Every structure is written in structure tokens, then in C-alpha cells.
Amino acid sequence: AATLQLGQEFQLKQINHQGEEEELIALNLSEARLVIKEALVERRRAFKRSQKKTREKELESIDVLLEQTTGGNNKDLKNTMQYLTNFSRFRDQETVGAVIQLLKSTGLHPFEVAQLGSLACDTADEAKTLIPSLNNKISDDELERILKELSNLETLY
Amino acid sequence: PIDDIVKNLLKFVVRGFYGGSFVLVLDAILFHSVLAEDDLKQLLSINKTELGPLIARLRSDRLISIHKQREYPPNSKSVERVYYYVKYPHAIDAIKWKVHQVVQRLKDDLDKNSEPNGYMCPICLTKYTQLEAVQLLNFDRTEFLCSLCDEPLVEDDSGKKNKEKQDKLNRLMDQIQPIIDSLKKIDDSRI
Amino acid sequence: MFFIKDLSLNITLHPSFFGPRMKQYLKTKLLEEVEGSCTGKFGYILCVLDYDNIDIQRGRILPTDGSAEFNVKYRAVVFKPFKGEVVDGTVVSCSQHGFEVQVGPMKVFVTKHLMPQDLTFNAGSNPPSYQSSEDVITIKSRIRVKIEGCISQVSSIHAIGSIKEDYLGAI
Numbered sequence A: 001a002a003t004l005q006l007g008q009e010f011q012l013k014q015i016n017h018q019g020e021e022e023e024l025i026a027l028n029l030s031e032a033r034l035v036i037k038e039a040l041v042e043r044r045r046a047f048k049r050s051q052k053k054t055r056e057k058e059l060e061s062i063d064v065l066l067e068q069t070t071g072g073n074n075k076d077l078k079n080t081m082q083y084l085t086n087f088s089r090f091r092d093q094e095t096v097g098a099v100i101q102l103l104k105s106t107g108l109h110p111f112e113v114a115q116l117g118s119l120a121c122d123t124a125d126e127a128k129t130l131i132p133s134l135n136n137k138i139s140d141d142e143l144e145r146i147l148k149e150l151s152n153l154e155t156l157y
Numbered sequence B: 001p002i003d004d005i006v007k008n009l010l011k012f013v014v015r016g017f018y019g020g021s022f023v024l025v026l027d028a029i030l031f032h033s034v035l036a037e038d039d040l041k042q043l044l045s046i047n048k049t050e051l052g053p054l055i056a057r058l059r060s061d062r063l064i065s066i067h068k069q070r071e072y073p074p075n076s077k078s079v080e081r082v083y084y085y086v087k088y089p090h091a092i093d094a095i096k097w098k099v100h101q102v103v104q105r106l107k108d109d110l111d112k113n114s115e116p117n118g119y120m121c122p123i124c125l126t127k128y129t130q131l132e133a134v135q136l137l138n139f140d141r142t143e144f145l146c147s148l149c150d151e152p153l154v155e156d157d158s159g160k161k162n163k164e165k166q167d168k169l170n171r172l173m174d175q176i177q178p179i180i181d182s183l184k185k186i187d188d189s190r191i
Numbered sequence C: 001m002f003f004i005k006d007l008s009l010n011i012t013l014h015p016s017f018f019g020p021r022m023k024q025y026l027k028t029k030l031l032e033e034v035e036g037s038c039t040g041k042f043g044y045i046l047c048v049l050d051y052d053n054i055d056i057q058r059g060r061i062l063p064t065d066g067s068a069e070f071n072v073k074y075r076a077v078v079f080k081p082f083k084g085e086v087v088d089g090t091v092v093s094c095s096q097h098g099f100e101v102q103v104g105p106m107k108v109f110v111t112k113h114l115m116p117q118d119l120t121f122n123a124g125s126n127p128p129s130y131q132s133s134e135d136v137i138t139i140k141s142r143i144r145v146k147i148e149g150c151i152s153q154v155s156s157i158h159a160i161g162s163i164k165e166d167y168l169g170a171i
């Protein structure tokens, strides 16, 4: 369950389609929307290429634009985008990139590093109540350190 | 002294949870330390079949021990007596833990009647898990319909039997009340 | 929970589409049936990355049906629930014994026994909401939902959420 017990399809050794071992890659609400729209950029980029021969509104107004770009029946993807904007709290990808560099410094398993980014809390104890994974892997003080650093980055856009 | 309380200790188990005659077999153990089975058969005028299992209840519950009284009579015949020995400290072992687990068991039915677990479609004769439930509740619905009856369910393991078990628990403590400290009275010496 | 994933798909291409431009229809169907789909094994398949560099290697013609069989490997992002996990959400409709919290693409239900006792159900309210000692939790309310159970059925994942614990109910 939520205690680092994930299936074969979600092991650390996520073999890329080139056939070699690689680390499991998870995504929190700190990268999901900022990668989905970016990929949609490529999608519309080819969509017009081969055709030749706050954050809230930037979410949905462009969601409909890429609904034009996509097949449009994936409105549940739009639900996910909405869920992101309502609860994904990063921007200016270098922001979250510094965050992730710090979390790489944390020596935390990528599941846990995603747990941190996804959750927006105040104390180490709140995390331990929500993330039994993140209770002792680092000093709880360091937990609050990085929680506070997030709160510094916790700015609504 | 303490061993006398052990002598009386098994009487608690024997005269409460068994019939009247069960102490009549136990009494004979206290009556004669080396209690010959052939004699104990005559003492209560019970036949071989009737006396047999009575010792087993005392044997199995570590209360008695049928010691193989092999000996050589004058006639040189195969002489055997089931000498019902009194293993006082080991019978304490049997009474001690038997009081231990029963208190847990009557507690178990209480918690089960406070946490509904499953469901039931009494129309389609189908019980459901909550995961089963979350499959046929419609977003236009408030209770999970069925697939054979397409009808709502009923919660399973509700709290109408909860009060039944507390009396059993209370009756357990009030009836085991003479037994609990009678063991600990002996356990002061640990003999 | 969101993951970047590399998935392999086998797509059957009916013979009529055997133009010089087969890969057109190929990528087409890939998107048409992979983005935004539910799997019991990977969770809702949200979006596909690298629309161009997709391994499309070689067809096989099924011995009958003459339809080519293609084994597409591609890299995408999926959303997967897990038991015991903590999420946000918002209700959609009401139930007599709990409420169904739309956690993004998927809707997570919280049952009557899954809620704290003080959170009682008001049927009279419109919409019938769930009222705690401190919180009246309604359709648009933001609920901190914890994922208790998950259904791994192919094409349909169902999640059991509960607010009986702390830090739950309203976010």
C-alpha cells in the first residue's frame, strides 16, 4: 500500500524502451501539469507541422485549445488538469527543479520525493500522519526544513 | 498449605464446568494418592466404560495423570492399574491459560458487532464487500444497486448483537471470579 | 499517483489501411486509444510523451484476417491510485452512506463507516452534504481524501477513500 509496496510495473528498475535498467520515475503535483502542457505543446507543434505538409485560466482556456489539438474525448484528462491547478502548487520549472535537486540531495527514494512535492504541509508530524513513509528516513527537523523551504516556494500563481 | 489450595483448586474447574460425578473421580485422587483405576471403578459403582473418559477429562486438562501402575502379583499375570496421579503444578498450567483466552473470545464478538464489514442483497441473495458495493452504486444513486436484482444492499454486521456479548463477558468475569485469584493464591508460592 | 511510464502496445491494423501512409493511421489510433484510458495494470493513461520518436518496428500479418500486427513501444504518463495514500478531491454527487470525491480524473467514494462519527449525513440538505462537528462537507468542498481501497479491474479502477482519520475532511 502507501508504505512503499508497489507492484512489478512499479519497481525501481523501469527499463526504458531501449532495453536497459533505469530508476523508477514518479510524478507529483509539482511536475504533472507543467509536463503535460509542455507535451501538448509538442503535440500541437506536430499537429500544425504535418498539417502544413493566473494559472487557473491558463489551465482550462488552453485545455480547450489542446482539446482541439487532441481528440477531445479525453475530458477526464481535463479533470486531471483541473485537479492539478487546484492542488499543484509550483511554476517556473526551475523552481521545482531546484526543489528536486534538493530532494535528490535528500537521498530519498523517488516515491518519497514525489510524496513531498505532492503534499503541501507544515510540520514533519503532519507528513508522518499523511506519509508513514516519511517519518524517520531523515531527521524530522530536516523534514520541517524542507517543508518550510517549500512554503517559501509555496506561492499561488 | 498452598498445595492444599491446589488440591481444592481443581475442584473449581471440576465442579463448575463438568457434571457432579467428575469430582467423584477427582475426589478419589485426593482420597488415595496412588489411586488404582480398578478401585476407583468400585468406589462410585460405575462400570469400565462410564469411568474411562472421566479420567481423560482430568488427564487432558492436566489435572490428573494416569500413572502406569505395573507390578507383579503372586500369580505372575499382566497386572496394570491406571494410577490417577495428581500433577498439582501442571494442572495450574491448564487452568491459568484457559481463563486467559476466553476473556478475549467474548470480546471479539463485541468489536465485530461495531464495525460493519460486508453487505447483502437479500433480494438477489447476494452478500457484497464494500469494494463490491462501489461497483454498482450509480452517480445517480445513493445505495449500491445489484446485478441480479439491480437493487440496493444492506449493511452487514450491525450493532444489534453488541449488547449480547457484554453479558457473556460480565458473566465470564463473575463466574471465573472464584477461579482467577485461586490460581494467583497458589502462584504466590509457585509450587 | 502520477508516473512517467514507457508502455508497449500491440495494434491491429486492418488491411484497408495499407497505404504508403500506414504510420499515419498508426500513431492516430495510438492516441485515439491510449491517452485518457483506464487499465487495471497502470491506471488511467493520461498523456503520451515524444509523439515523434515512437518505436513502431515491424508488422506481422496474422495468418488469417490478413491484418497486420504492430508492437508499438511508447512512453507516457499514468495516474495510479494506491491504498493508504493521501490525496485532495471534490465531491460529485451524494450517497446515503457517504459521498463520492472526484479525485481528478477518477472519482473516489467515501462510505458511511469510512467517516468520523460526528460527520453525519443530512438528506434534507440540497445537495445532501455531510456535516461534522466542525465541517459541513458539500459537493464542491475540498476534501483531503485518503485512498483506502483500490479496484484493479482492467479498464476500471475503483478507489475507497475515507476521512475517518485526522487531517481529513476539508483540506
Ligand SMILES: [Zn+2]
Residues within 6 Å of the ligand: B121, B122, B123, B124, B125, B126, B146, B148, B149, B150, B151
Ligand atoms: Zn438482488
